[PDB]
Amino acid sequence: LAAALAQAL
Ligand SMILES: *C(=O)c1ccc(-c2ccc(C(=O)OCC)cn2)nc1
Ligand SMILES: *NNC(=O)c1ccc(-c2ccc(C(N)=O)cn2)nc1
Ligand SMILES: CCc1ccccc1
Ligand SMILES: CCc1ccccc1
Ligand SMILES: CCc1ccccc1
Ligand SMILES: CCc1ccccc1
């Protein structure tokens, strides 16, 4: 989950 978001950065 964290990674799913972190791709933005
Ligand atoms: C959410 O974006 C998220 C959570 C956890 C994972 C993930 C990917 C790969 C592994 C892995 O290779 O584990 C080896 C024990 C674990 N968790 N991806 C995305
Ligand atoms: N928001 N994330 C990025 O801008 C980003 C993170 C990580 C990478 C990247 C690219 C290539 C490798 C590799 N070949 O091991 C690892 N991480 N790009 C963009
Ligand atoms: C449903 C959001 C999500 C994304 C990736 C991993 C787990 C959960
Ligand atoms: C963690 C990378 C990812 C995101 C969404 C769906 C599958 C795999
Ligand atoms: C900026 C694109 C995006 C949207 C949602 C989650 C991650 C990345
Ligand atoms: C940031 C890791 C990742 C990989 C594939 C897809 C989304 C996110």
Side-chain angles (χ1 to χ4, degrees):
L1 169 56
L5 308 187
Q7 67 179 310
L9 309 181

mmCIF file with all atom_site columns, all heavy atoms in Angstrom, unseen atoms left out:
data_model
loop_
_atom_site.group_PDB
_atom_site.id
_atom_site.type_symbol
_atom_site.label_atom_id
_atom_site.label_alt_id
_atom_site.label_comp_id
_atom_site.label_asym_id
_atom_site.label_entity_id
_atom_site.label_seq_id
_atom_site.pdbx_PDB_ins_code
_atom_site.Cartn_x
_atom_site.Cartn_y
_atom_site.Cartn_z
_atom_site.occupancy
_atom_site.B_iso_or_equiv
_atom_site.pdbx_formal_charge
_atom_site.auth_seq_id
_atom_site.auth_comp_id
_atom_site.auth_asym_id
_atom_site.auth_atom_id
_atom_site.pdbx_PDB_model_num
ATOM   1   N N   . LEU A 1 1 ? 0.828  -1.215  0.000   1.00 0.00 ? 1 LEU A N   1
ATOM   2   C CA  . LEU A 1 1 ? 0.000  0.000   0.000   1.00 0.00 ? 1 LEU A CA  1
ATOM   3   C C   . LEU A 1 1 ? 0.872  1.279   0.000   1.00 0.00 ? 1 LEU A C   1
ATOM   4   O O   . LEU A 1 1 ? 0.675  2.182   -0.814  1.00 0.00 ? 1 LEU A O   1
ATOM   5   C CB  . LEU A 1 1 ? -0.923 -0.025  1.206   1.00 0.00 ? 1 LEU A CB  1
ATOM   6   C CG  . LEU A 1 1 ? -1.668 1.271   1.497   1.00 0.00 ? 1 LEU A CG  1
ATOM   7   C CD1 . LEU A 1 1 ? -2.516 1.785   0.314   1.00 0.00 ? 1 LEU A CD1 1
ATOM   8   C CD2 . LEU A 1 1 ? -2.535 1.104   2.743   1.00 0.00 ? 1 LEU A CD2 1
ATOM   9   N N   . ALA A 1 2 ? 1.841  1.359   0.922   1.00 0.00 ? 2 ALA A N   1
ATOM   10  C CA  . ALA A 1 2 ? 2.692  2.542   1.000   1.00 0.00 ? 2 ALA A CA  1
ATOM   11  C C   . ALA A 1 2 ? 3.337  2.765   -0.393  1.00 0.00 ? 2 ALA A C   1
ATOM   12  O O   . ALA A 1 2 ? 3.387  3.878   -0.912  1.00 0.00 ? 2 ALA A O   1
ATOM   13  N N   . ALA A 1 3 ? 3.847  1.684   -0.983  1.00 0.00 ? 3 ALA A N   1
ATOM   14  C CA  . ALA A 1 3 ? 4.510  1.778   -2.281  1.00 0.00 ? 3 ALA A CA  1
ATOM   15  C C   . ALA A 1 3 ? 3.582  2.290   -3.378  1.00 0.00 ? 3 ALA A C   1
ATOM   16  O O   . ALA A 1 3 ? 4.018  3.048   -4.251  1.00 0.00 ? 3 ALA A O   1
ATOM   17  C CB  . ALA A 1 3 ? 5.101  0.425   -2.662  1.00 0.00 ? 3 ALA A CB  1
ATOM   18  N N   . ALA A 1 4 ? 2.328  1.853   -3.332  1.00 0.00 ? 4 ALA A N   1
ATOM   19  C CA  . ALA A 1 4 ? 1.319  2.250   -4.312  1.00 0.00 ? 4 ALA A CA  1
ATOM   20  C C   . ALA A 1 4 ? 1.214  3.785   -4.373  1.00 0.00 ? 4 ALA A C   1
ATOM   21  O O   . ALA A 1 4 ? 0.993  4.376   -5.418  1.00 0.00 ? 4 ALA A O   1
ATOM   22  N N   . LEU A 1 5 ? 1.333  4.416   -3.198  1.00 0.00 ? 5 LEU A N   1
ATOM   23  C CA  . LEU A 1 5 ? 1.320  5.876   -3.118  1.00 0.00 ? 5 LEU A CA  1
ATOM   24  C C   . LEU A 1 5 ? 2.666  6.486   -3.471  1.00 0.00 ? 5 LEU A C   1
ATOM   25  O O   . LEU A 1 5 ? 2.741  7.468   -4.211  1.00 0.00 ? 5 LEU A O   1
ATOM   26  C CB  . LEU A 1 5 ? 0.917  6.337   -1.708  1.00 0.00 ? 5 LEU A CB  1
ATOM   27  C CG  . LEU A 1 5 ? -0.384 5.717   -1.195  1.00 0.00 ? 5 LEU A CG  1
ATOM   28  C CD1 . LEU A 1 5 ? -0.794 6.364   0.131   1.00 0.00 ? 5 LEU A CD1 1
ATOM   29  C CD2 . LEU A 1 5 ? -1.504 5.871   -2.202  1.00 0.00 ? 5 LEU A CD2 1
ATOM   30  N N   . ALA A 1 6 ? 3.726  5.880   -2.923  1.00 0.00 ? 6 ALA A N   1
ATOM   31  C CA  . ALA A 1 6 ? 5.087  6.408   -2.984  1.00 0.00 ? 6 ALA A CA  1
ATOM   32  C C   . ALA A 1 6 ? 5.551  6.564   -4.437  1.00 0.00 ? 6 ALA A C   1
ATOM   33  O O   . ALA A 1 6 ? 6.446  7.364   -4.721  1.00 0.00 ? 6 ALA A O   1
ATOM   34  N N   . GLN A 1 7 ? 4.961  5.809   -5.377  1.00 0.00 ? 7 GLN A N   1
ATOM   35  C CA  . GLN A 1 7 ? 5.369  5.946   -6.765  1.00 0.00 ? 7 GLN A CA  1
ATOM   36  C C   . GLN A 1 7 ? 5.234  7.399   -7.251  1.00 0.00 ? 7 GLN A C   1
ATOM   37  O O   . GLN A 1 7 ? 5.981  7.806   -8.150  1.00 0.00 ? 7 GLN A O   1
ATOM   38  C CB  . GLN A 1 7 ? 4.574  5.025   -7.683  1.00 0.00 ? 7 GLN A CB  1
ATOM   39  C CG  . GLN A 1 7 ? 3.097  5.372   -7.793  1.00 0.00 ? 7 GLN A CG  1
ATOM   40  C CD  . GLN A 1 7 ? 2.360  4.439   -8.730  1.00 0.00 ? 7 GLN A CD  1
ATOM   41  O OE1 . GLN A 1 7 ? 2.779  4.191   -9.869  1.00 0.00 ? 7 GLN A OE1 1
ATOM   42  N NE2 . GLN A 1 7 ? 1.263  3.884   -8.246  1.00 0.00 ? 7 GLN A NE2 1
ATOM   43  N N   . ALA A 1 8 ? 4.300  8.175   -6.683  1.00 0.00 ? 8 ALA A N   1
ATOM   44  C CA  . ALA A 1 8 ? 4.104  9.583   -7.050  1.00 0.00 ? 8 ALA A CA  1
ATOM   45  C C   . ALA A 1 8 ? 5.410  10.404  -6.868  1.00 0.00 ? 8 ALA A C   1
ATOM   46  O O   . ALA A 1 8 ? 5.616  11.405  -7.529  1.00 0.00 ? 8 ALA A O   1
ATOM   47  N N   . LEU A 1 9 ? 6.216  9.953   -5.890  1.00 0.00 ? 9 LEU A N   1
ATOM   48  C CA  . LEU A 1 9 ? 7.481  10.583  -5.539  1.00 0.00 ? 9 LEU A CA  1
ATOM   49  C C   . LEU A 1 9 ? 8.687  9.740   -5.953  1.00 0.00 ? 9 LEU A C   1
ATOM   50  O O   . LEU A 1 9 ? 9.813  9.901   -5.523  1.00 0.00 ? 9 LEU A O   1
ATOM   51  C CB  . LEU A 1 9 ? 7.574  10.835  -4.027  1.00 0.00 ? 9 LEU A CB  1
ATOM   52  C CG  . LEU A 1 9 ? 6.360  11.554  -3.434  1.00 0.00 ? 9 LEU A CG  1
ATOM   53  C CD1 . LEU A 1 9 ? 6.562  11.782  -1.941  1.00 0.00 ? 9 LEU A CD1 1
ATOM   54  C CD2 . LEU A 1 9 ? 6.043  12.870  -4.141  1.00 0.00 ? 9 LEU A CD2 1
HETATM 55  C C1  . LIG B 2 . ? 1.712  -1.441  -1.060  1.00 0.00 ? 1 LIG B C1  1
HETATM 56  O O1  . LIG B 2 . ? 1.929  -0.576  -1.876  1.00 0.00 ? 1 LIG B O1  1
HETATM 57  C C2  . LIG B 2 . ? 2.577  -2.674  -0.959  1.00 0.00 ? 1 LIG B C2  1
HETATM 58  C C3  . LIG B 2 . ? 2.834  -3.357  0.215   1.00 0.00 ? 1 LIG B C3  1
HETATM 59  C C4  . LIG B 2 . ? 3.730  -4.414  0.174   1.00 0.00 ? 1 LIG B C4  1
HETATM 60  C C5  . LIG B 2 . ? 4.299  -4.736  -1.036  1.00 0.00 ? 1 LIG B C5  1
HETATM 61  C C6  . LIG B 2 . ? 5.296  -5.860  -1.066  1.00 0.00 ? 1 LIG B C6  1
HETATM 62  C C7  . LIG B 2 . ? 5.957  -6.112  -2.242  1.00 0.00 ? 1 LIG B C7  1
HETATM 63  C C8  . LIG B 2 . ? 6.922  -7.113  -2.286  1.00 0.00 ? 1 LIG B C8  1
HETATM 64  C C9  . LIG B 2 . ? 7.182  -7.811  -1.147  1.00 0.00 ? 1 LIG B C9  1
HETATM 65  C C10 . LIG B 2 . ? 8.233  -8.912  -1.205  1.00 0.00 ? 1 LIG B C10 1
HETATM 66  O O2  . LIG B 2 . ? 8.938  -9.132  -2.128  1.00 0.00 ? 1 LIG B O2  1
HETATM 67  O O3  . LIG B 2 . ? 8.296  -9.578  -0.012  1.00 0.00 ? 1 LIG B O3  1
HETATM 68  C C11 . LIG B 2 . ? 9.310  -10.596 0.041   1.00 0.00 ? 1 LIG B C11 1
HETATM 69  C C12 . LIG B 2 . ? 9.156  -11.256 1.432   1.00 0.00 ? 1 LIG B C12 1
HETATM 70  C C13 . LIG B 2 . ? 6.485  -7.511  0.028   1.00 0.00 ? 1 LIG B C13 1
HETATM 71  N N1  . LIG B 2 . ? 5.583  -6.521  0.034   1.00 0.00 ? 1 LIG B N1  1
HETATM 72  N N2  . LIG B 2 . ? 4.054  -4.073  -2.154  1.00 0.00 ? 1 LIG B N2  1
HETATM 73  C C14 . LIG B 2 . ? 3.202  -3.051  -2.123  1.00 0.00 ? 1 LIG B C14 1
HETATM 74  N N1  . LIG B 2 . ? 8.421  8.747   -6.873  1.00 0.00 ? 2 LIG B N1  1
HETATM 75  N N2  . LIG B 2 . ? 9.403  7.859   -7.233  1.00 0.00 ? 2 LIG B N2  1
HETATM 76  C C1  . LIG B 2 . ? 10.336 8.171   -8.206  1.00 0.00 ? 2 LIG B C1  1
HETATM 77  O O1  . LIG B 2 . ? 10.406 9.252   -8.706  1.00 0.00 ? 2 LIG B O1  1
HETATM 78  C C2  . LIG B 2 . ? 11.274 7.028   -8.507  1.00 0.00 ? 2 LIG B C2  1
HETATM 79  C C3  . LIG B 2 . ? 11.708 6.151   -7.524  1.00 0.00 ? 2 LIG B C3  1
HETATM 80  C C4  . LIG B 2 . ? 12.577 5.153   -7.866  1.00 0.00 ? 2 LIG B C4  1
HETATM 81  C C5  . LIG B 2 . ? 13.002 5.060   -9.173  1.00 0.00 ? 2 LIG B C5  1
HETATM 82  C C6  . LIG B 2 . ? 13.958 3.965   -9.526  1.00 0.00 ? 2 LIG B C6  1
HETATM 83  C C7  . LIG B 2 . ? 14.395 3.895   -10.813 1.00 0.00 ? 2 LIG B C7  1
HETATM 84  C C8  . LIG B 2 . ? 15.245 2.884   -11.136 1.00 0.00 ? 2 LIG B C8  1
HETATM 85  C C9  . LIG B 2 . ? 15.659 1.974   -10.159 1.00 0.00 ? 2 LIG B C9  1
HETATM 86  C C10 . LIG B 2 . ? 16.566 0.801   -10.467 1.00 0.00 ? 2 LIG B C10 1
HETATM 87  N N3  . LIG B 2 . ? 16.874 0.602   -11.794 1.00 0.00 ? 2 LIG B N3  1
HETATM 88  O O2  . LIG B 2 . ? 16.963 0.064   -9.601  1.00 0.00 ? 2 LIG B O2  1
HETATM 89  C C11 . LIG B 2 . ? 15.194 2.114   -8.872  1.00 0.00 ? 2 LIG B C11 1
HETATM 90  N N4  . LIG B 2 . ? 14.356 3.111   -8.575  1.00 0.00 ? 2 LIG B N4  1
HETATM 91  N N5  . LIG B 2 . ? 12.566 5.879   -10.122 1.00 0.00 ? 2 LIG B N5  1
HETATM 92  C C12 . LIG B 2 . ? 11.720 6.861   -9.806  1.00 0.00 ? 2 LIG B C12 1
HETATM 93  C C1  . LIG B 2 . ? -6.401 -1.014  -1.976  1.00 0.00 ? 3 LIG B C1  1
HETATM 94  C C2  . LIG B 2 . ? -5.093 -0.214  -1.886  1.00 0.00 ? 3 LIG B C2  1
HETATM 95  C C3  . LIG B 2 . ? -3.851 -1.110  -1.858  1.00 0.00 ? 3 LIG B C3  1
HETATM 96  C C4  . LIG B 2 . ? -2.847 -0.961  -2.810  1.00 0.00 ? 3 LIG B C4  1
HETATM 97  C C5  . LIG B 2 . ? -1.759 -1.821  -2.792  1.00 0.00 ? 3 LIG B C5  1
HETATM 98  C C6  . LIG B 2 . ? -1.663 -2.796  -1.826  1.00 0.00 ? 3 LIG B C6  1
HETATM 99  C C7  . LIG B 2 . ? -2.645 -2.926  -0.874  1.00 0.00 ? 3 LIG B C7  1
HETATM 100 C C8  . LIG B 2 . ? -3.744 -2.101  -0.902  1.00 0.00 ? 3 LIG B C8  1
HETATM 101 C C1  . LIG B 2 . ? 3.339  -2.678  -5.406  1.00 0.00 ? 4 LIG B C1  1
HETATM 102 C C2  . LIG B 2 . ? 3.217  -2.521  -6.896  1.00 0.00 ? 4 LIG B C2  1
HETATM 103 C C3  . LIG B 2 . ? 1.795  -2.831  -7.329  1.00 0.00 ? 4 LIG B C3  1
HETATM 104 C C4  . LIG B 2 . ? 0.804  -1.856  -7.302  1.00 0.00 ? 4 LIG B C4  1
HETATM 105 C C5  . LIG B 2 . ? -0.485 -2.176  -7.696  1.00 0.00 ? 4 LIG B C5  1
HETATM 106 C C6  . LIG B 2 . ? -0.775 -3.456  -8.117  1.00 0.00 ? 4 LIG B C6  1
HETATM 107 C C7  . LIG B 2 . ? 0.206  -4.431  -8.138  1.00 0.00 ? 4 LIG B C7  1
HETATM 108 C C8  . LIG B 2 . ? 1.494  -4.117  -7.740  1.00 0.00 ? 4 LIG B C8  1
HETATM 109 C C1  . LIG B 2 . ? 0.028  11.011  -9.230  1.00 0.00 ? 5 LIG B C1  1
HETATM 110 C C2  . LIG B 2 . ? -0.508 9.647   -9.681  1.00 0.00 ? 5 LIG B C2  1
HETATM 111 C C3  . LIG B 2 . ? -0.897 8.770   -8.501  1.00 0.00 ? 5 LIG B C3  1
HETATM 112 C C4  . LIG B 2 . ? -2.228 8.717   -8.087  1.00 0.00 ? 5 LIG B C4  1
HETATM 113 C C5  . LIG B 2 . ? -2.575 7.937   -7.002  1.00 0.00 ? 5 LIG B C5  1
HETATM 114 C C6  . LIG B 2 . ? -1.620 7.225   -6.320  1.00 0.00 ? 5 LIG B C6  1
HETATM 115 C C7  . LIG B 2 . ? -0.311 7.269   -6.739  1.00 0.00 ? 5 LIG B C7  1
HETATM 116 C C8  . LIG B 2 . ? 0.052  8.034   -7.828  1.00 0.00 ? 5 LIG B C8  1
HETATM 117 C C1  . LIG B 2 . ? 7.069  2.109   -6.024  1.00 0.00 ? 6 LIG B C1  1
HETATM 118 C C2  . LIG B 2 . ? 6.952  0.631   -6.389  1.00 0.00 ? 6 LIG B C2  1
HETATM 119 C C3  . LIG B 2 . ? 5.896  0.351   -7.450  1.00 0.00 ? 6 LIG B C3  1
HETATM 120 C C4  . LIG B 2 . ? 6.108  -0.641  -8.388  1.00 0.00 ? 6 LIG B C4  1
HETATM 121 C C5  . LIG B 2 . ? 5.148  -0.884  -9.362  1.00 0.00 ? 6 LIG B C5  1
HETATM 122 C C6  . LIG B 2 . ? 3.985  -0.126  -9.390  1.00 0.00 ? 6 LIG B C6  1
HETATM 123 C C7  . LIG B 2 . ? 3.776  0.849   -8.445  1.00 0.00 ? 6 LIG B C7  1
HETATM 124 C C8  . LIG B 2 . ? 4.730  1.082   -7.475  1.00 0.00 ? 6 LIG B C8  1
#
